[PDB]
Ligand binder design. Structure first.
Ligand SMILES: C[S@@+](CC[C@H](N)C(=O)[O-])C[C@H]1O[C@@H](n2cnc3c(N)ncnc32)[C@H](O)[C@@H]1O
Ligand SMILES: C[S@@+](CC[C@H](N)C(=O)[O-])C[C@H]1O[C@@H](n2cnc3c(N)ncnc32)[C@H](O)[C@@H]1O
Ligand SMILES: [Zn+2]
Ligand SMILES: [Zn+2]
Ligand SMILES: [Zn+2]
Ligand SMILES: [Zn+2]
Ligand SMILES: [Zn+2]
Ligand SMILES: [Zn+2]
Ligand SMILES: [Zn+2]
Ligand SMILES: [Zn+2]
Lengths: 8, 273, 267, 9
């Protein structure tokens, strides 16, 4: 994606 | 020698069951104020979450919801909470199931055994200044494995909105598939979880939970301890590679663990070949 | 007399609300779902956008006249103990805007009374002539929050077709609370022509003007054991008095068979 | 005036 996201 | 100062008696301003103080023994940075503390998720555009009470799956128990006949437990194969509100030793910590807690449509009482996350924070935590990772959260007590710590609370947003957010340091994807997926952004509005750092050797794990609604687009993210946690230990989860693949251009991991996968050294080594 | 339910609210309120019957053989009423907060059964889209909340900047306990939230009702009407000021308008109450999650103040500020829930000890009990009612188990000073009228939020149009109209409350395109199928302790509060509580419209976690929440406060000091009651109003009695008449009780009764018959003799 | 009875302020 464009932006960083924390995720499981 | 710098002293440790208490710089906020309670960052949650009385909204949590317990205070969450802030200290700094490292530098002159004052208590972080550039966000709004909220104890429950907020909305800033219309999400149309399904709140129709007649859509709730619910149980018919009149006991404490500890029998195998609790429908709400069955929606996760079984209730995973022991008699003290902790995840069973056998809980799958690699691929956690979705948890369906009891709700307002259930015939049981508000203090049944399947209400852990909806009852809120019980452990004592502290916001503190770390040496290398800005602000972090640490335990002020021992915490057994399987204990509910806190929820990842913030602003609910679409995947598309998440993609255009300038600050991407506090985003949490609710679903890893594509299509109509949503995120929590804790940048502007968040709770204590917004200050939890990434650790390559994590001591807490995120678990998707349903409480007052069962709109599958909007699971609530509950952190539970993945092992026994010692007093004073920094809390941390594995933010995952969908964070680090992007962020490691800008900074690298300072967790300091021999298992670190995202330090400059780790990245440099993998790069070499 | 006999305690037949230790808590009709099943632990959802701050305190238990027991049920007794010392009058007849009617069992504890269970033909409804007890809920402590309003529910939805169709798409209502209550406006919960945090940026639409009017909110204050107070760094004190919201006891000053400079609190924006207080100013939205000309002033905060709560005294330091959470009770309505003596001067509160009990005939035409104002809309109260409590502090909320956008406010800078603490959760225990002085403008958070209704959102903090039930504190008085109440009891569901069998009356002599009006089925089940609610009474006080303690003295209650004037201006004290008692409970909220909680139920199912519905449109005016749905409310017009509801087969049972014994538990409907008009909020004010008007919406209603129906407490027939889903409700709390307030669903059992009877009408009194000499009322001792009054309903007040309140905003808390949202400020969607379609959906005020209904808070009952004591309109006078109330004695231990006294039945609680409010004036349901003529938009109830004009319709209902064809089916039954008022069983208070009171020498001030305006809705008894006798009262109505007397006024009818209007030549 | 409406078809059903409602309590009100
Ligand atoms: C959700 S915030 C955590 C709170 C943050 N430390 C603060 O002071 O607000 C995520 C950010 O903290 C920093 N951070 C968290 N874990 C880190 C790590 N293991 N190494 C380096 N920086 C980290 C990064 O700046 C990251 O983008
Ligand atoms: C909102 S409910 C109150 C609880 C009701 N007493 C019960 O047992 O469920 C309204 C119904 O209560 C009864 N009721 C309430 N106040 C009354 C009064 N003052 N006189 C006669 N019946 C009354 C009527 O049956 C009315 O339609
Ligand atoms: Zn159950
Ligand atoms: Zn239950
Ligand atoms: Zn249940
Ligand atoms: Zn690391
Ligand atoms: Zn204020
Ligand atoms: Zn306030
Ligand atoms: Zn305010
Ligand atoms: Zn009467």
């Amino acid at each position: 994606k464009q932006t960083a996201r924390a995720s499981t | 020698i710098r002293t440790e100062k208490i710089i906020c008696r309670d960052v949650a301003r009385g909204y949590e069951n317990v205070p969450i103080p802030c200290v700094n023994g490292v530098d002159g940075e004052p208590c972080p104020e550039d966000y709004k503390y909220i104890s429950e998720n907020c909305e800033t555009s219309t999400m149309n979450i399904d709140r129709n009470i007649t859509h709730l799956q619910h149980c018919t128990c009149v006991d404490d919801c500890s029998s195998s006949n609790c429908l709400c437990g069955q929606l996760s194969i079984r209730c995973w909470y022991d008699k003290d509100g902790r995840l069973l030793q056998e809980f799958n910590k690699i691929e956690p199931p979705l948890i369906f807690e009891c709700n307002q449509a259930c015939s049981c009482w508000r203090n049944c055994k399947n209400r852990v996350v909806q009852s809120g924070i019980k452990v004592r935590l502290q916001l503190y200044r770390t040496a290398k990772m800005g602000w972090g959260v640490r335990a002020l007590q021992t915490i057994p494995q399987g204990t509910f710590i806190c929820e990842y609370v913030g602003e609910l947003i679409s995947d598309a909105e998440a993609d255009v957010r300038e600050d991407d340091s506090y985003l949490f994807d609710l679903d890893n598939k594509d299509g109509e997926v949503y995120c929590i952004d804790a940048r502007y509005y968040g709770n204590i979880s917004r200050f939890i750092n990434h650790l390559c050797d994590p001591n807490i794990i995120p678990v998707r939970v349903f409480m007052l609604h069962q709109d599958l687009r909007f699971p609530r993210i509950a952190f539970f301890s993945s092992r026994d946690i010692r007093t004073g230990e920094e809390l941390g989860f594995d933010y995952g590679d969908r964070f680090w693949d992007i962020k490691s251009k800008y900074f690298t991991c300072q967790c300091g663990s021999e298992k670190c996968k995202h330090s400059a050294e780790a990245i440099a080594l993998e790069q070499s070949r």
